[PDB]
Paper text:
Here we systematically compare RT fragment screening of the Fosfomycin-resistance protein A from Klebsiella pneumoniae (FosAKP), an enzyme involved in antibiotic resistance, with conventional single crystal data collection at cryogenic temperature (cryo). Fosfomycin, a broad-spectrum antibiotic, is routinely used to treat urinary infections. However, natural resistance can exist in gram-negative bacteria, mainly through the enzyme Fosfomycin-resistance protein A (FosA), that catalyzes the Mn2+ and K+-dependent glutathione mediated inactivation of Fosfomycin. Therefore, increased interest exists to identify inhibitors of FosA to enable the use of Fosfomycin to also treat resistant strains24.
Over all screens, a total of 31 out of 95 fragments are observed binding to FosAKP. For comparison, the same screen was conducted with conventional single crystal data collection at cryogenic temperatures (100 K) from loop-mounted crystals at beamline P11 at PETRA III. In total, 7 fragments bind in the two RT screens, of which 3 bind to pharmaceutically relevant sites 1, 2 and 4. In contrast, 31 fragments are observed binding in the cryo screens, but only 6 of these bind to the more interesting sites 1-4.
Numbering used by the authors:
A (entry chain A), B (entry chain B): 1 to 137
Write the structure that this text describes.
Amino acid sequence: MLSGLNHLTLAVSQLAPSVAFYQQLLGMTLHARWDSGAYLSCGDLWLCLSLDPQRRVTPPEESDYTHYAFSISEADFASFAARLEAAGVAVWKLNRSEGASHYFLDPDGHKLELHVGSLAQRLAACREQPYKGMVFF
Amino acid sequence: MLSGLNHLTLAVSQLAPSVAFYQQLLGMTLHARWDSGAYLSCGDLWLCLSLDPQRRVTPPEESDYTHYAFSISEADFASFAARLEAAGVAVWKLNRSEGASHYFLDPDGHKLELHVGSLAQRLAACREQPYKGMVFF
Ligand SMILES: Cc1cc(CNCCS(C)(=O)=O)ccc1Br
Ligand SMILES: [Mn+2]
Ligand SMILES: [Mn+2]
């Protein structure tokens, strides 16, 4: 059967600024870089950045809600979000509809998120403040 | 400090066929569903399906290379690929890299992959046969 996410691959329009964003700004671990891509890790996550001439820099109003959330502790969340804000990182959402989250964009407009909490914690919170029509299995 | 992927959220145009795809076809566990979304798990992966009127059913020629790969064992790979084929699931790429990979599309055209192999395995292969311009850290 399927056992988890093997890797996340993001198409990027310019390799160097994307590597800098994920490694320097977000603090992910850079393992390899070549003319057309890079491999990073974020804890157990394998992230690939793939240089793609088809990737467009996409404003958030032009893309759907597909997004990628990274885990951060309650102790680190606010200062990390504030550092991104002070660095001029663009945002895409303000309303906290799924808990403690900070919504921000990568250089190509990929929709990213910092989130505090697990799925179990989100289910427990939703039992008290459920989304409309919610059923739990 | 970021510690991993917290969740992957896919925007979907029709919630029922997307739930059927991820739960019934791909075997993920459905934890909750509401009028505009669902939460599933696949091992450690927290997957959210979010009903989004902005999601277009997108042909693979019209999207970039961003994609989401799920882990499967080598022993299970061929029968899972055959299950997807029986269900008429379209393929968007042939494998030409190390480790088994099956590249398939979800109902809205999200680019998915089954992959056998870790980052460590990929890096080992790359060290022996580096991509053009490849540098390691
Ligand atoms: C830091 C780094 C950069 C590059 C890009 N070098 C570009 C050189 S040129 C003269 O063609 O502009 C590759 C690997 C690492 Br690691
Ligand atoms: Mn989210
Ligand atoms: Mn891949």
